[PDB]
Amino acid sequence: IEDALKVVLRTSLVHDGLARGLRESAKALTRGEGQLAVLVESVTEEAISKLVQGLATENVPLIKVADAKQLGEWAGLGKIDRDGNARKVVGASVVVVKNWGADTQEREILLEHFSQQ
């Protein structure tokens, strides 16, 4: 569901858990750091997503949310001073959650479900 994703992104934004990008994401996945990964399939030439898959194959669970620009928007990359979006364009190709921070029950049931697949 949509709720657990925003909850986990908030809990990793406040405690610096988001590997906002792909190089930091790749380094976190290579290390014992990246506990979750959200990436978009609407990526040109698709090789970055394939490389990410590989990173998660070796810290396993991944999420397949679309709308890269929207993904960055609700990923907290924006300063979002006003109520509405105050920046033209901002987005993230890959988001990696390292620090689980605060825990909510619905989100943990969701991550167990996505682990079960």
Place this chain on the structure above:
RNA sequence: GGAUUGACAGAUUGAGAGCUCUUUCUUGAUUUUGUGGGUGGUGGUGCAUGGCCGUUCUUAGUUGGUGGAGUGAUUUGUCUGC
């Protein structure tokens, strides 16, 4: 899918300065380039100013209130003496 940051080694440099280049690696929204604006300045103006000090002046000199004289600026009080 990199605003950016930093650097081993060499050219360069006086430098063991990643100042600049060769290559590449690191770093994550603090930044970078433009506008407004702001700071910093033993920059200018002591002939824009404050404060302070110096000097006129180490002398004994100043001042206003009622009163008198002048239309008045001013004067007497602040003086002939000792």
